[PDB]
Design a protein around this ligand. Structure first.
Ligand SMILES: CCCCCCCCCCCCCCCCCC(=O)OC[C@H](COP(=O)([O-])OCC[N+](C)(C)C)OC(=O)CCCCCCCCCCCCCCCCC
Lengths: 70, 318
């Protein structure tokens, strides 16, 4: 006879359980990364803002020099 | 000559809106294990043309119980406000170089809500009224936090001018020292345009279509292009605010390419968010911004007003 049957040793394994691998970093790591990014941004902003203030002072004194003729 | 400039501003954004419909459909299909439109033309390049020609040869269907004057005025106001609020954006030179462009965009974003409100009220239907009141709730949820976020992030720029924002980010990006404000701003821009997961006005689950349920083809397309031009303008605004690119005065095409690809990535992130999240309830969105975002926004505003005084880093206003 010929029918639809499983083999002698059966079929392979079949999963039925929830699989969540829990990928990622701990909270301390991401918080430290954020704090370091904030500090780097603050330092770069302080340097560029001081330079921009000096440039603005230079332009203002240029206007001071040009004022009496106008 | 200024007519040439304004038409070359307003026609490519309409073409961008149509191809944004195409890109939205195709990308959203590909994130859902399927294909987008590819049968209309070569890789579906002619689908927005077919949609636009189809929608403008259909019946308008003005209802009998609706006040016709407001019913016509509301989509006109929506498309108009979506058009004359792209202007102050520097690309890298804005068409209109306003000294107070940030407040201008805030005011005209507050004004665009009235189109949704009058569309809901004008068409005499209960679902339209529900959509209009949900728009009101969304506006009172997001507006104050959005304005305080903008004020706190503009304390490092120096002034409200959008043209000087490139000079501020000439050294480093503005997302490095203001990334919590950047995240809160991104959520605020998501909730501003009634985009997912804060749709809540064109809700196809709780309602049928919301405020535009009585708007048939022709006027219905106006709200669609207004919404899509709005999301592109929010993406460009966020790119200018937090991702300022290198600008060469001799080669503006470098800045144009840079902020173009950055705004494209931001729109791709918008559609990425759209396909992956369930819809918020409109009372949970109300308690989201008023309880979680607002105290942190106030604390960050005090931090950003006490920071440049602390460090001798007060930016110039000229
Ligand atoms: C523009 C750049 C990119 C931005 C990100 C864009 C891509 C990512 C998008 C992700 C998907 C977003 C989909 C919409 C989500 C909507 C929900 C939502 O946002 O809820 C917000 C939720 C709200 O929480 P909730 O909704 O769960 O409410 C909890 C309510 N209780 C507690 C009562 C149960 O979170 C926030 O509001 C957080 C805002 C950002 C916080 C940033 C903190 C920065 C660090 C501060 C300092 C910390 C250290 C301690 C102090 C140290 C001092 C030195």
């Amino acid at each position: 006879v010929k029918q639809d049957m499983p083999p002698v040793g059966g079929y392979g394994p079949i999963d039925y359980k929830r699989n969540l691998p829990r990928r990622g970093l701990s909270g301390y790591s991401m918080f430290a990364v954020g704090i370091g990014a904030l500090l780097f941004g603050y330092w770069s902003m302080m340097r560029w803002n001081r330079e921009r203030r000096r440039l603005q002072i230079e332009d203002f004194e240029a206007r001071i020099a040009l004022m009496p003729l106008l | 000559m200024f007519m040439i400039n304004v038409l070359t501003l307003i026609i490519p954004i309409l073409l961008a809106v149509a191809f944004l419909t195409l890109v939205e459909r195709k990308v959203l299909g590909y994130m859902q294990f399927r294909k987008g439109p590819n049968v209309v033309g070569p890789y579906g390049l002619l689908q927005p043309i077919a949609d636009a020609i189809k929608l403008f040869i259909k019946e308008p269907l003005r209802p009998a119980t609706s006040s016709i004057s407001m019913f016509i005025l509301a989509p006109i106001l929506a498309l108009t406000l979506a058009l004359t609020m792209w202007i102050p954006l520097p690309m890298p030179y804005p068409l209109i170089n306003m000294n107070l462009g940030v407040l201008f965009m805030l005011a005209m974003s507050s004004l665009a809500v009235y189109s949704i409100l009058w569309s809901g009220w004008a068409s005499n239907s209960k679902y339209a009224l529900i959509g209009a009141l949900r728009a009101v709730a969304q506006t009172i949820s997001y507006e104050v936090t959005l304005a305080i976020i903008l004020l706190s992030v503009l304390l490092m720029n120096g002034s409200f001018t959008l043209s000087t924002l490139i000079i501020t980010q000439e050294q480093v990006w503005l997302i490095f020292p203001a990334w919590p404000l950047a995240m809160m701003w991104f959520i605020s821009t998501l909730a501003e345009t009634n985009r997912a997961p804060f749709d809540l006005t064109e809700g196809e689950s709780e309602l049928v279509s919301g405020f535009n349920v009585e708007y048939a083809a022709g006027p219905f397309a106006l709200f669609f292009m207004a919404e899509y031009a709005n999301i592109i303008m929010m993406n460009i605004f966020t790119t200018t605010l937090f991702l300022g690119a290198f600008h060469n005065p001799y080669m503006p095409e470098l800045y144009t390419i840079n902020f173009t690809i950055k705004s494209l990535l931001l729109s791709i992130t918008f559609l990425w968010i759209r396909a992956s999240y369930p819809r918020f309830r409109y009372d949970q969105l109300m308690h989201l911004l008023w309880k979680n975002f607002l105290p942190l926004t106030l604390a960050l505003c005090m931090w950003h007003v006490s920071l440049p005084i602390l460090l001798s880093s007060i930016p110039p206003q000229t």
